[PDB]
Design a protein around this ligand. Structure first.
Ligand SMILES: CC(=O)N[C@@H]1[C@@H](O)[C@H](O[C@@H]2O[C@H](CO)[C@@H](O[C@@H]3O[C@H](CO[C@H]4O[C@H](CO)[C@@H](O)[C@H](O)[C@@H]4O[C@@H]4O[C@H](CO)[C@@H](O[C@@H]5O[C@H](CO)[C@H](O)[C@H](O)[C@H]5O)[C@H](O)[C@H]4NC(C)=O)[C@@H](O)[C@H](O[C@H]4O[C@H](CO)[C@@H](O)[C@H](O)[C@@H]4O[C@@H]4O[C@H](CO)[C@@H](O)[C@H](O)[C@H]4NC(C)=O)[C@@H]3O)[C@H](O)[C@H]2NC(C)=O)[C@@H](CO[C@@H]2O[C@@H](C)[C@@H](O)[C@@H](O)[C@@H]2O)O[C@H]1N=[N+]=[N-]
Ligand SMILES: CC(=O)N[C@@H]1[C@@H](O)[C@H](O[C@@H]2O[C@H](CO)[C@@H](O[C@@H]3O[C@H](CO[C@H]4O[C@H](CO)[C@@H](O)[C@H](O)[C@@H]4O[C@@H]4O[C@H](CO)[C@@H](O[C@@H]5O[C@H](CO)[C@H](O)[C@H](O)[C@H]5O)[C@H](O)[C@H]4NC(C)=O)[C@@H](O)[C@H](O[C@H]4O[C@H](CO)[C@@H](O)[C@H](O)[C@@H]4O[C@@H]4O[C@H](CO)[C@@H](O)[C@H](O)[C@H]4NC(C)=O)[C@@H]3O)[C@H](O)[C@H]2NC(C)=O)[C@@H](CO[C@@H]2O[C@@H](C)[C@@H](O)[C@@H](O)[C@@H]2O)O[C@H]1N=[N+]=[N-]
Ligand SMILES: CC(=O)N[C@@H]1[C@@H](O)[C@H](O[C@@H]2O[C@H](CO)[C@@H](O[C@@H]3O[C@H](CO[C@H]4O[C@H](CO)[C@@H](O)[C@H](O)[C@@H]4O[C@@H]4O[C@H](CO)[C@@H](O[C@@H]5O[C@H](CO)[C@H](O)[C@H](O)[C@H]5O)[C@H](O)[C@H]4NC(C)=O)[C@@H](O)[C@H](O[C@H]4O[C@H](CO)[C@@H](O)[C@H](O)[C@@H]4O[C@@H]4O[C@H](CO)[C@@H](O)[C@H](O)[C@H]4NC(C)=O)[C@@H]3O)[C@H](O)[C@H]2NC(C)=O)[C@@H](CO[C@@H]2O[C@@H](C)[C@@H](O)[C@@H](O)[C@@H]2O)O[C@H]1N=[N+]=[N-]
Lengths: 40, 40, 40
């Protein structure tokens, strides 16, 4: 399938990005998106 | 609760979207957001 | 590491946000991003 599974998910409050490691190809592809990060 | 759990998470480097399958209602609802996708 | 693991992921179709609970600090930090939500 064109969509591929996420194997690990992390987020970073310095860069304000979340990064999803993908099961695809050689294993070195990620998805990454902007995000808010805050303390509740 | 208004927030509902994600059951499966996939991302697509053709559409540049990630899709989260949700545990809600009939099971056919998703969350989907734009994302970057790249090789590290 | 600057990126930290997500422990739980939820999405909300009233607020159109997904929220990732993070393993960081006191445990009360989240990442949150805008998202589409729809029925397939
Ligand atoms: C003791 C200790 O260490 N304690 C820990 C804390 O330090 C740590 O908190 C982090 O601390 C960082 C350092 O203080 C701090 O970094 C600063 O952040 C400032 C604010 O950043 C916001 O505004 C800027 C500019 O507008 C944006 O670029 C940022 O992205 C951010 O904006 C946010 O962006 C996201 C993504 O786009 C938005 O998200 C969207 O939200 C909407 C809804 O609103 C939807 O949901 C969307 O879907 C979603 O995507 C957010 O809305 C938005 N939020 C806001 C309020 O706008 C920066 O301004 C600041 O940058 C300056 O300083 C650095 C160096 O320090 C320079 O490199 C930069 O260039 C810049 O320098 C300035 O440059 C200008 C001009 O260029 C100049 O005029 C100035 O004078 C310069 N100033 C200086 C000082 O040089 C800097 O980056 C972090 O913000 C802060 N993080 C958080 C989350 O609070 C906390 C948290 O730890 C972090 O998170 C955890 C989870 C871990 O990952 C951890 O490792 C990480 O550190 O932990 C404390 N420890 N504890 N407990
Ligand atoms: C052999 C093999 O198959 N190898 C595999 C590779 O093929 C595969 O890589 C994919 O290859 C695709 C085909 O080459 C390629 O598609 C093209 O992509 C071009 C670039 O797309 C970017 O720009 C366009 C336009 O600006 C945007 O629409 C796209 O969304 C994308 O922009 C990105 O968008 C995201 C989301 O908004 C941004 O994300 C944000 O980032 C910020 C920070 O920057 C924050 O984090 C935000 O939170 C975050 O959301 C990105 O920043 C941004 N990036 C950039 C750089 O801007 C398209 O331009 C191109 O489209 C043209 O061609 C198609 C048909 O081919 C037409 O349908 C389109 O209409 C368009 O046609 C053109 O139309 C114009 C005018 O309308 C005309 O003038 C032109 O002449 C027309 N040209 C043609 C040719 O017709 C096309 O879609 C993929 O980009 C490429 N993917 C990646 C990730 O590199 C790789 C990867 O595989 C993919 O990913 C994996 C994970 C799996 O899902 C897999 O199934 C999937 O295929 O794998 C190789 N195999 N291996 N290993
Ligand atoms: C019986 C039952 O209960 N059934 C259940 C359904 O109720 C439930 O569906 C939810 O129902 C809600 C109530 O009807 C409904 O709320 C309304 O939504 C309207 C539409 O909201 C869209 O447009 C507005 C404005 O433009 C935006 O603010 C919203 O964010 C949203 O836009 C979307 O935003 C996201 C994020 O930015 C976009 O995402 C991006 O997408 C792009 C691609 O497009 C990329 O992927 C990006 O990465 C991604 O981020 C979307 O694209 C975008 N979509 C669109 C189409 O634009 C609101 O307009 C409406 O607000 C009015 O009413 C409320 C009160 O009701 C007021 O508080 C507001 O202020 C506002 O009031 C109006 O104010 C104006 C001026 O200020 C005034 O002129 C008007 O007269 C006022 N009107 C009123 C009536 O007062 C309101 O919020 C939900 O939309 C609907 N949700 C969905 C998903 O369909 C469903 C689903 O349940 C939900 O989801 C699940 C998963 C669970 O979480 C659940 O708990 C939750 O309820 O379930 C049914 N049950 N079943 N099965």
């Amino acid at each position: 399938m064109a969509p591929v599974p996420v194997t690990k998910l992390v987020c970073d409050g310095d860069t304000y990005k979340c990064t999803a490691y993908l099961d695809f190809g050689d294993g070195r592809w990620v998805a990454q998106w902007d995000t808010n990060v805050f303390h509740t």
